[PDB]
């Protein structure tokens, strides 16, 4: 049973577990939509009150579980709280990261293919003042890549290039994963993370060199870090912030769990945990935030940039930014560094979220790692044809898995641990082996404040928001829902087969 070779590599694998497209694509959008410093106050408080305490919880659960030879939730949950219903609530730990992995690798597939075309100079050349005559070639460029419908039909038809780049991205994930935890993953994490922070810093610097009549890049800064204290009363903001906090730290993914289960029993989660997190927060609020937004706020001024991120998630990353760059000396290459940064950022993140499914096939169904990975790739590859060819199918999985399910699972796994399993046994399992220890106040966050946050939020969500989604939507949503439900069923059948194999051989041995 594998463990992390070196401590730094651990932290670097854990920081790359958190760090990814969320730092770069996602964060700028959620902050732009939610109005800068109006988003940050919630984001920070959520970080302390939710992200922080939740990460230690997931850490401990992973380590505690790995000690018993179990990396995933369906197993671990049985241990903390003994039930057939503990296993069932644990199937969300396989399900969330799987469904997320489905559309996530595909979006990272985009970054790779763009970086490729952007290097070789296959990008479009805009006409030598007007923003729309500028952004359009790139809008068309992305739309041509992912095959956005020209018709009414909710039907995507990606390019032969995008398709093959996905197969490649899939291969590259396999190649990292098939070498295991220390050899495959921990190596790459040591390479990638510095390789990442360097590319980011360079871009941050190079982006600060932008000025137009419309603004400096220091305009975007003071938009992001200067509060609106009135929006403190707006629930949608608080809902947006925690959605970022979860997604950013890979909370509720059953990710931190699986990785941490390869931590040796004695090893400190209480420092390495905090470190890899504070690394991500750097890659988010410091690096990630200081690139995409300030560039647009510089070119188009604030209000227009804010209007671009509302117009789509991929507007800023895949369209606006490379467009801005093309107005500068060697901007096509500076674009390649953008998408190259993204690929490497998503590659550390994607190998993390495909692991839980792999660790399961290993720890439970007793599959060779080679086999665990191939099938995990096969399932993800196949299932994603839905995301690729069906319009807005991507939106659906993001909502159920990486939006709702993550919060549902976070509160769930906090309850199972800090309540059912009991407070102090958990409080011990955390600080145990710790190089340093969790502040006494954080005991009382984990027990009360944290779940009080998630429960109340999950209310203000369900009551004041959700039904419109479940109602107003086009009927193609039921195709994704159908499938990803049959994924839960499929997974539950494996949890079933696992406990059956357990019952049979344990009676013979
Ligand atoms: Na992130």
Automatic annotation (TrEMBL):
Key word Transferase present: no
Name assigned to this protein: Na(+):neurotransmitter symporter (Snf family)
Subcellular location: Membrane
UniProt record, GO biological process: sodium ion transmembrane transport
Transmembrane segments: 8-25, 37-57, 88-107, 160-179, 191-209, 237-262, 283-308, 336-361, 373-393, 399-421, 441-463, 475-498
Sites where the protein binds phosphocholine 2: 84
Keyword tags: Membrane, Transmembrane, Transmembrane helix, Transport
PROSITE patterns hit by this protein: NA_NEUROTRAN_SYMP_3
An example Gene Ontology CC term for this record: plasma membrane
Main location: membrane
Residues reported to bind phosphocholine 1: 84
Cross-referenced InterPro entries: Na/ntran_symport (IPR000175), SNS_sf (IPR037272)
Record's bilayer topology term: Multi-pass membrane protein
A Pfam match: SNF
Superkingdom classification of source: Bacteria
Cross-referenced CDD domains: LeuT-like_sbd
């Amino acid at each position: 049973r594998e463990h992390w070779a070196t401590r730094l590599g651990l932290i670097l694998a854990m920081a790359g577990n958190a760090v990814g497209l969320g730092n770069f694509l996602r964060f700028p959008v959620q902050a732009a939509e939610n109005g800068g410093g109006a988003f940050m106050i919630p984001y920070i408080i959520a970080f302390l009150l939710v992200g922080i305490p939740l990460m230690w919880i997931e850490w401990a659960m992973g380590r505690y579980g790995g000690a018993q030879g179990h990396g995933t939730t369906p197993a671990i949950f049985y241990l903390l709280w003994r039930n057939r219903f503990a296993k069932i609530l644990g199937v969300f730990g396989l399900w969330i990261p799987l469904v997320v992995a489905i559309y996530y690798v595909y979006i990272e597939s985009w970054t790779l293919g763009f970086a490729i075309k952007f290097l070789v100079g296959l990008v479009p050349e805009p006409p030598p003042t007007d923003p729309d005559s500028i952004l359009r070639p790139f809008k068309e460029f992305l739309y041509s890549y992912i095959g956005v419908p020209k018709g009414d039909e909710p039907i995507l038809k990606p390019s032969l290039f995008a398709y093959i780049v996905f197969l490649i991205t899939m291969f590259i994930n396999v190649s990292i994963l098939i070498r295991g935890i220390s050899k495959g993953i921990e190596r790459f994490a040591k390479i990638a993370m510095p390789t990442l922070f360097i590319l980011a810093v360079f871009l941050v610097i190079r982006v600060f060199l932008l000025e137009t009549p419309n603004g400096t890049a220091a305009d975007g800064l003071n938009f992001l870090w200067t509060p609106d204290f009135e929006k403190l009363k707006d629930p949608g903001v608080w809902i947006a912030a925690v959605g970022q906090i979860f997604f950013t730290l890979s909370l509720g993914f059953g990710a931190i769990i699986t990785y941490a289960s390869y931590v040796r029993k004695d090893q400190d989660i209480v420092l390495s945990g905090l470190t890899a997190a504070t690394l991500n927060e750097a890659a988010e609020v410091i690096l990630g935030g200081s690139i995409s937004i300030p560039a647009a706020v510089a070119f188009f001024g604030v209000a227009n940039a804010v209007a671009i991120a509302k117009a789509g998630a991929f507007n800023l990353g895949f369209i606006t930014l490379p467009a801005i760059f093309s107005q500068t000396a060697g901007g096509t290459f500076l674009g390649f560094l953008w998408f190259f940064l993204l690929f490497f950022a998503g590659l550390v993140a994607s190998i993390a979220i495909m692991q839980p499914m792999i660790a399961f096939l290993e720890d439970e169904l007793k599959l060779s790692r080679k086999h665990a990975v191939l099938w995990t790739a096969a399932i993800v590859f196949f299932s994603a044809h839905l995301v690729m060819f069906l319009n807005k199918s991507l939106d659906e999985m993001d909502f159920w898995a990486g939006t709702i399910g993550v919060v549902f699972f976070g509160l769930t796994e906090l309850i199972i641990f800090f309540w059912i399993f009991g407070a102090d046994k958990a409080w011990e399992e955390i600080n145990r082996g710790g190089i340093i220890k969790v502040p006494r106040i954080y005991y009382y966050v984990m027990r009360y404040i944290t779940p009080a946050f998630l429960a109340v939020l999950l209310v203000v969500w369900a009551r004041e928001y959700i039904p419109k989604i479940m109602e107003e939507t086009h009927w193609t949503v039921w195709i994704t829902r159908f499938y990803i439900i049959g994924l839960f069923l499929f997974l539950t059948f494996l949890v079933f087969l696992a406990e059956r194999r357990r019952n049979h051989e344990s009676a013979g041995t």
